[PDB]
Symmetry: D3
Subunit: 169 residues, 6 copies
């Protein structure tokens, strides 16, 4: 049984990311989705806490009919040592075989540790990235389109827009 | 929409705990299951890492037909300050309303923070607790009975018995 | 009893800060004065150690005759979790009713935690900010004027000018 | 100026400690009073947070007629490296000259750094220990008589008894 | 090149430890000597600081003529995550091939990480353990005998006996 | 015995630093060499782990004919409190007397603690900075000539070039 690993900040979790996740789910049996930088919250760049993000990511995946048996959602706070980050991820995740990531460091860190590393099967355009979303949330610009309905609801509940706006004064 | 919170070490996740979880699931809409002491591993008292435990707890819940939309599985490392632990749980979980727990500290900490706290609707006997399980794993005594099949499989994969035994020399 | 809270780096404690403290003291019974970033020291931006600033405040608030029963001085180091910061502050301070701040992040954080948040009743021009005081110590300007005597005295003892000047080299 | 240092858990602050403090003032211009183990709270041995203790101290010292210029109250959280604790204490406090401690480690550590060290002037009788005080709160005893009224009023506000008692269950 | 690894508290470095180190040096090209619990100091159990023990080893290994090209001395503080410990050790040490330990936990940890694990080639009676050395310094026994001269010399400089004796009071 | 201290990132160790080290030995009985920022690795500015650096140092010092009794190599991880760094350094090293540093903060901090401080004897030309060395590895330049062979052999073993280059993508 083959398990893959993915790591992203998910600020917030958007359709782009989701399309990538479904993509990987066609190559592996189970995917371990790691919410990176779980310590950052309340900032224009990282406005949501690990909690809210686990929530968005949980409701969005069970909303798209993706069987809980196919994935794991784990928060991962950043640590001072790059040389200890993989060991850090490993202690928080189930045993995995392939690491999906197009980031040089993440690739190199896992690569150096013996894992098989590849780039995600899909690449979404910046127009769909969180920066657009957050940018729209502030500039009142239909950020919802870029997000899964369940995620909009999470954002609605936690007053995501109100927050990111005040933090922007 | 009502959400409850539960916190346990889950070393390992056993049928007792599971029966309690299904119990709470009849009173609340969603349950946030917190794997406490996520930093302890490789010891007779706490032999499994946060990772393996998220895994057991994930496979056992999707094995009993419990809809992913009804729960959240979050690791929670212990912190030096009891006075900051609830804020610690809150930052890692989705917004919750009721805290289930029969432990004086956990009750008092959440109670003091404004949350509604009650005792779990069900109480399993020690013969079913992790101490029995671990005790059996060492003493070769049919620990499997006490655990959900999916959990046995996790334990099998990570060589749980081999580990806890060596740690016991 | 009305307890308010204020939080700033006080690097160093200058007259404006005291003008504001005196004014907040007109609408609240007691004022909790939290020394932010208590862990930063020996830098052009943050030259004094938490210890020294706790000395500056205590000495200035006395020099200006202010019943010690009306204020508290508590150092507070920064934590990597903004979502944990308020609970952190709370754990180190007497129970308070209102928070005084102009910073959006401090404002939002304390607000999301359910506290009454408000702006200081007085805003002081940069001309009298810590930057101006620090820049003078460096360029041999008139820094003593921008500060309470007891503060000038503390700075002389610890050799603040000497230190800040060396670090500038 | 001759500043002396004093360190203790103060769980909670009792008349005994107070007289000791007055005694020390009789031989030191100023008394830097460090509240140890600031990170512990909500346990039988350490019921109060630090902020709570900072309140008791600040209140008792202002109600027993003691110049706010003659003392400092600094919460100090314990740290793993004993060989780095005195430095820690220093960093969080004003400059001192003599350490008043009855504890061997506290003595050996401060002296090792070169500080003048000497035992506490008085040695308040028993019936004046946090233990007896905490015990009475548990067993409905007369703890109030062992604490300065100013402190008793604090314990009432934070419902200490109710806490220590629930925690005790 | 065959690099082995050893790890112990060395509180203090005694003859037996050296007898074992010399023997491990007969089957490996270089030996990585990790000073465990580098954060503990000033206690009856762990009296010396990482600094001092790094001095003891370096001085003893030289006194006994051992090419410096054959060994490394690296302090290692303990971390709360056993599952992270090996990666921690690795980050601080040259690449190694085999680990020498009698402790089950160190054995299991390094083993689960894929390293060759083996017992020291020599076991020394308690009579010559750190406990015996420490107990003599306290009871005025013959501690110098149980240790290499360079070690006795280091202990004299830092006043190890004085310290250990005071902490005993 | 007159021990002097030296601190640097050594990313990586080059001939320049080495000559500086020999120079210092010409005026100090022993040289405590602290490798700073031990917690950084796998970045362009800090490619090597600490264990890697400890290897380069240990190797270069044993191959350039220098008595293992005349030096110590101690990895030092940076810490948040500048006012607690020299104490930190102390705790991890043998007792020293003089600090050789060209850095203003390092100077101001050590001197503030009372240590004799003086600049590095030599001032090795440019073309001998980690920057140039790291640059050459990136641009297939001749970095080897800037490092002692002993170090070059280390970089080859940990495939530094391959790393810094991938990281660079
Ligand atoms: N030492 C440490 O603590 C350490 C070391 C490495 C990484 N991390 C963490 O790992 C997490 C992952 O970081 P990362 O480098 O992937 O950055 P990231 O998760 O922040 O994403 C980087 C960029 O990649 C884009 N992206 C991601 N997947 C994409 C895809 N399939 N198609 C198109 N664009 C895509 C994102 O929109 C974003 O702008 C972070 O939270 C980081 O902090 C921590
Ligand atoms: N400051 C802090 O870091 C802090 C403060 C409080 C709690 N915690 C953490 O919270 C977690 C929860 O601790 P806890 O007090 O519940 O202890 P626990 O999870 O270890 O469980 C305590 C005992 O309760 C039993 N139990 C649990 N639910 C039961 C039920 N329904 N019926 C019968 N028996 C049951 C378990 O088998 C166990 O023996 C721990 O991991 C603890 O470390 C951390
Ligand atoms: N997670 C965390 O650790 C966390 C989260 C938030 C804030 N903090 C800390 O809170 C502390 C307070 O930060 P802050 O945002 O107030 O910044 P600050 O204290 O550094 O002050 C910000 C600026 O506002 C000016 N200012 C303050 N009060 C003023 C007034 N009444 N009139 C005019 N100018 C005024 C100051 O002179 C300064 O230039 C900091 O130490 C910060 O690090 C920590
Ligand atoms: N590395 C570290 O984090 C580190 C190292 C050393 C000490 N500390 C801290 O230092 C603090 C001080 O501890 P401590 O040993 O003084 O304990 P303490 O003062 O909190 O209590 C020790 C006992 O001394 C008694 N006592 C004190 N003065 C007395 C007097 N004059 N007459 C009679 N009885 C008296 C108290 O009633 C109490 O029972 C602790 O909070 C400890 O955590 C921390
Ligand atoms: N997570 C973590 O931080 C973590 C996990 C595991 C181990 N460690 C550390 O690893 C270090 C090593 O621990 P350890 O288990 O070896 O304990 P230890 O170094 O304290 O030694 C254990 C006992 O074994 C004895 N001993 C050692 N070698 C011997 C030999 N060849 N013959 C006879 N007796 C011998 C010692 O004298 C001692 O009484 C410790 O500092 C420990 O804290 C840390
Ligand atoms: N609180 C803390 O954690 C804290 C406080 C202070 C310093 N530090 C650490 O101290 C370490 C030392 O830093 P640093 O400032 O010495 O930097 P460094 O030595 O790592 O580099 C500074 C520059 O000095 C150059 N240099 C040094 N000696 C020279 C000489 N004789 N001739 C020519 N050029 C020379 C180096 O080539 C380099 O470019 C750092 O790793 C830093 O992180 C940490």
């Amino acid at each position: 049984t083959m398990r893959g690993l993915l790591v992203g900040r998910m600020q917030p979790f958007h359709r782009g990311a989701l399309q990538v996740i479904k993509s990987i789910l066609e190559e592996v049996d189970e995917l371990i989705i790691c919410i990176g930088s779980a310590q950052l919250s309340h900032s224009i760049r990282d406005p949501f806490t690990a909690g809210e993000r686990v929530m968005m990511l949980t409701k969005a995946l069970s909303e798209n009919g993706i069987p809980a048996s196919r994935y794991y959602i784990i928060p991962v706070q950043d640590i001072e040592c790059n040389a200890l980050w993989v060991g850090h991820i490993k202690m928080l995740t189930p045993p995995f075989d392939r690491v999906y990531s197009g980031n040089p460091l993440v690739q190199r860190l896992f690569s150096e540790d013996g894992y098989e590393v590849t780039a995600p099967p899909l690449f979404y355009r910046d127009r769909y990235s969180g920066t657009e979303v957050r940018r729209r949330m502030l500039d009142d610009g239909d950020w919802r389109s870029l997000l899964p309905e369940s995620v909009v609801e999470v954002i609605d509940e936690i007053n995501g827009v109100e927050r990111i706006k005040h933090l922007a004064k």
